[model samples]
Target: ADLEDNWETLNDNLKVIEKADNAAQVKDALTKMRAAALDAQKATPPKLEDKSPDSPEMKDFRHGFDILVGQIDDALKLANEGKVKEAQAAAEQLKTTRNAYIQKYLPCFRPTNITLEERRLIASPWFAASFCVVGLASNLLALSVLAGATRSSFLTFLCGLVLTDFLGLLVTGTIVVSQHAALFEWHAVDPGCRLCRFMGVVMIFFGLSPLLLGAAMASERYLGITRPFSRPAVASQRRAWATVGLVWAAALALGLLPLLGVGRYTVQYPGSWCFLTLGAESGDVAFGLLFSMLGGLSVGLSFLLNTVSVATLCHVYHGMKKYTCTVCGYIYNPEDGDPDNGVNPGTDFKDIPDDWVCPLCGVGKDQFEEVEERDSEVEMMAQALGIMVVASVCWLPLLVFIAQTVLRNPPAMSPAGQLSRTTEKELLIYLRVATWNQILDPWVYILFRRAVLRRLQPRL
Candidate 1:
């Protein structure tokens, strides 16, 4: 078959690279190897059921293959320059990439067992425990701060976010910690797959709630500021509590879908956690896409709503002094002038026509007097926006990483051919970075206060 021919050609050239003496011989071997790598890329790897050349998984594989090709060309160029020894040394790096690529795409070539050092590096107890301990303390402290503050719908939603983070850390942390503590077989402890399913559900539920809550809170403020009269009950604490409950219910429902067979829950790397399967099966693709899409939408919506709300708040806080017509009681804010009467935004009252009359009662500008006051609520709303900004910043990397993984059609975490260990390490790194969201969420309200603002800008 063509597959075997390509394999033989590739292997033969690889062997020449190891045995050749002169620069000319090495260059010849490297050139043929590059050609074979290119040829192999056009053909689908055996056992990977999806055979489309353009499929995300295949594209990802080709991407890795080309990286090796590039290194080979670099080595060949070195040989051309008479640096045969350096070229040979550089070519040595090619083996690691070749091995990793074969492990993911060519299942027959993957090793059945890894060394102890490799196992420990991927799943370290110290790594898991440090994040768990710090995240727990931060969330608890944030919850206490919210509890003690003057209760508002904003603080209420924040409390709900903190609660979700706390519970998520506690539950997932216990499983990861206990697994590390005992080093027991997952199958022995969970023969029925119940533990895997439970962990998967919890992961989805907790992962999504914070993002959804952030958007919900942003919407509440957006409505409060832009359409205050449209919903008089918008600012109620009870409403925020109900909305938080609704977010959790929605996330929980999505998490439960895997249980209902819409997708599947599978053990992830190192056998310590479970998540939605990332295989190419229709159900797996559907669930993965749904999770990424919903999470992405929440983050996007939060950004839009928060930006608008903050802009409105800034206008209110720094608007030019307004003049009230003494006879008509009409207050003119320079931020939004009488546009119907040839006035524009940012046009101060004095810049308006001296001959102009109040639209309401026909009073001349001479009757107008200055009206000025400020609200503490604007400061509070600004602080709330700060929290949403932090939340989005903290969670976005993981969200995007997940989206990329799903779109790329990651292999299921199974022995046949799992996602490359490089990918697994990157995924855990992003997850750990996202954990800082829980830690930083509380600090926004605690540290970004009037005292801090005054120090940063004395006029506050």
Candidate 2:
């Protein structure tokens, strides 16, 4: 068969390249290998007559062709560098590309051969239960807090985060668990794997939405408390709700763009899990960078706002304390139980003397506006901001992993090397971080907001 002849020629050329002592010899060997790969690609026709243009078989052929071309290009570059060792090393990479094409496409040429056990696992209750437990619990907690909290704007922003996570899990968790379980035992054919691609898009959207929302929360808090009167609209609940809706809609639109055929989804290294495919010339890296930049800008702005708000709040609280002492004519150390202020009414205006004059507005004590700080929106904003920051930090590593996978095309390793170690570590870190976001948020609400906790305790 022509296919068998191409494989034989490819192997012969690979041996020649491996045994070559000079750049010229290696370059000649690379040319032969390139020809063989091209012939192999041309010889292997699509097995299924009804296969679509985007079918996995066609995709694998195209991708394999690209990889072969890239390997040849790299070999030429190394030869130009006058480095025989490097050129040989680059040529060896062709073997990996060849193997990947054979593994992925060979299976597709055969008819459906998956077992029933794979089907059961794909539709298992355990997968559904685990995903539901985490997804529902986290979203409900966020929604409940947003509904009852005093700072409706901040709560609305938090709700946006929950909404993103909820929807992301709804789509991704369903598709991934099912496809993975099916694929693991070969139950799913090439066309059936389309679901994996759709899930990949959902994962990215959900993953980034919470981070974006956190940043928004931080920025809002910073502007609300630190730069309070600068822009009143910045703190408006209506604006916050609108902003949240707009962000979700935009993310949904962008994440779904790949499905329109501008990009592709493929299996992760070792072929255990499906994900977005990215590399040089893949166009995914560019799009990913754009998305990352938008998310990063949101995070950076929020960080700046949170830092300034915390500092300003501290400074104002201390400054007010000093001014109050001077005006009261009583060294009121409330913690030491100074009975002069009659129980030291845990209020901000207690520091202002009955007859003292306001410095900023220049109003006498009789006319001074009482600064009755009764659970201001800033407190709720601060709580939400704190939660968002923690969640963002947890997600940062996963973002880094995504960037690495997109920007660099590393050599493929064994399944144990890829999944059992590297991918597992990355996934474990993400899950742990997500766990903190899920479990700690409710506990934080309970600790900070007494009313919410009080309402829930009796029912429990």
Candidate 3:
């Protein structure tokens, strides 16, 4: 419900109302203030959450917004009738009204017991911390997989992505778990809102960085496989780092825009952290829409480019069938050969010595018969799809949620509180699922290896 943005805008206009002397100015300020009040009513107050719908507390909470909205309407009416002095006095009274409500319902002054759902919203501290630990381990494994391996542009981006995800998980996870464990009131800890802004920037930057790297990786693969000669020899690891830097630069700039006033970063539900505000204001709308478009486009481009890259690989590898010695079942794969026999990796059977015999059974080359190829082509497709599928599943929910929330009018808030838990429960789930993308991304590639596959199936 973007209660934080709504409340802040309401206060900002309240100040405008107090300072306004002319009829027109007072009317304009009241109008915006009233709209903000209407928006805030949709946020359920924590104090009223436990009460029944018909309870007096709930009734008074509902009546308070109506009273505030009615007061603004009355002031607006007076200004319309040219009663500038009276309107100004009435507008001044809105402060008292808004403050009374703020103290009762929107107060962030005191610490409260975390709700059951709130704990589960972040999946509980122990569970959340465990994921962080395992995720870091998985990302480390991915980095090890690349270490001393071929140093290509693709590997460079892969290296950068794993490191980014690793650090992202470590940083965000620690803060969340600590917040949950301590149950510290964010207002008490960050009275200046600087901490909230820092969290907002980190969330946005880390969220987009990996997706951008994924797209870059796919593009590198596409160019390398589909248009090999088009790339210059100078497209080395240094250039890859430049691309990584550019991706980082772009993500950092986007995240920093909210700080510069193009958008807003507001504390989200449960008040532990901040994110792009999903308010109806121009700035809020623009930021949410931009974030969704960039993220969605990243996932979509990766899918398309990866599909093309996999197709190119299939087209090239399908003709390279394996041959087996009819007598001993010694298979000869062009992609690699046993070093014990004097053949090297990527050594095609046609290039091997005619006099060379199968190392396993000493069968002559003439005894080798062309057998059906392994499912390497199919396996390659799985590897491509595995990465893309996990990425989409992890990111698409949050992207769609942003688009859906932004395109539509703001939803109703809880009448008694600063938030509507019902509305945000789904959002919380989406946020949790999105984090899984980073953790699962490394595992997808690691587990899909041919060696890993063979270990799972000994008969292979």
Candidate 4:
């Protein structure tokens, strides 16, 4: 009741000041009253503990103030040019705008309750559900394929890569989607919201997992094709299984590091996503640098490995002497049975062949013999590697975006600032793309892998 009485008195005085005839007196009186109101408002509101200067809300306030100051300077110039009436009008307008801002929007900066309706508007349920379905379906398909296929050293490693991608999607997708759903529906900031923390950890884990697995796949392929005679101990089933266990254990440990106070999970824009802190915290910078390093290393190493593998295959194919196909000048391998092995009589002809014969059935010089059929194991590994490369391309940009934004800590401005809006929108778009990429992994696998697609088509 006392608060209401104070508010009523303040409103009445504001009306009187608005109608006052003497502009100078009215302006002075209103300024003083505005200062008093600000003081009272501060006293009544709950204070935020451990306020960070780098917070987006604080940055926005700082930016808005700077813009207002610039406008005030321009208004003063107008007054100096004998535009007194215009200057006075501008000053009044500024006062009104400032007051409305403080009253209507300033309190939102404080962490407080958001309504369920508001959360729903901010988050997309369809996106979450779609992602969940894809993650589940793709992981299952990959696992089934790996189980049915014959095992080789290359196959084992490739299987591990697929498993990593599958696990990443399964674990990270569920946590993130479920967390968003719960937070949106509950609209409460309970400590139990620790689920968001776990989700954030899972995201980081998956984000890095694919990169490591890709690197492993590439290295295995390089060794198999380029140094087949000296290939390192073939990744056995036991080794592959152990590697997978280690990857998960490492991921779990890395995820839990934040809980140990090495970093933190904070709500991102629109309150739908959360991220690990990339701030002044001791481990934050190190963690970011680590991922950046891994991403760079994965890209470089994978490129080199693939190049070596492809070159070796080409070299072996070109060196064949006895291979001759009826369709092309190239020699054909008599021992080859698979039609897809690039050895047909039509393909062996130097000129138009009378009739294209399956080259393996009637070979000439035997160039096809040297066409080292990529170990089905190696081909599968390459596919896994290819998927990881795609994943890296899709997600690395987001990490860079976040890193740049966090490091730059650009001043936030009012909704009216065009640049601010553009930057925010770009960040949001990158985030959405990254999320969709995670969801699309399964479909992507099917599209790229003929075997998986062929198997699934009948069921569909």
Predicted candidate 2 versus true structure: per-residue lDDT over 1-460, tens digit per residue: 3554665576688889898899888888788777777776665442333456677866776677778877887897898778999998888887666655543343122223334664454445465548556766766776776566443566667666666666665565555455455544322423334445555566556655676777777877765554323223445878898888777777777677667755555554223344444333345676656556666676677777777767755544543332222232222223433234343434345554565444434445454232223354546655766665766676555556556655655522221112234554465455446534544544444455657557879979
Clashing pairs in 1: none
How big is the positional error of residue 47 in model 3, measured in Å on the Cα after superposition?
A: 15
Q: TM-score of model 4 relative to the true fold?
A: 0.56
lDDT of 1 by residue, 31-79 (tens): 8878877887776664455346677777787887688788888998998
Q: What tens-digit string does per-residue lDDT give for candidate 4 at 271-324?
A: 555556444444655665555566667767878787767766565545323333
Which predicted model would earn the best lDDT? Answer: 3
At residue 202, give the lDDT of candidate 2: 67
> Total clashing residue pairs per candidate?
0, 0, 10, 24
lDDT of 3 by residue, 243-312 (tens): 9999999999999998788776655655555678655557767898899899999999989988887776
Superposition error at 374 for model 2 (Å): 4.4
Top candidate by TM-score: 1
Which residue ranges in model 2 land beyond 4 Å of their true spot?
1-128, 145-151, 180-190, 229-235, 260-263, 269-273, 321-374, 407-447, 452-460
Ranking by lDDT: 3, 1, 2, 4
**Steric clash pairs (candidate 2):** none
TM for every model, in the order presented, reads 0.63, 0.55, 0.61, 0.56
User: Candidate 2 — worst ten consecutive residues by lDDT sum?
Assistant: 411-420
Worst 10 residues of 1 by lDDT: 103-112
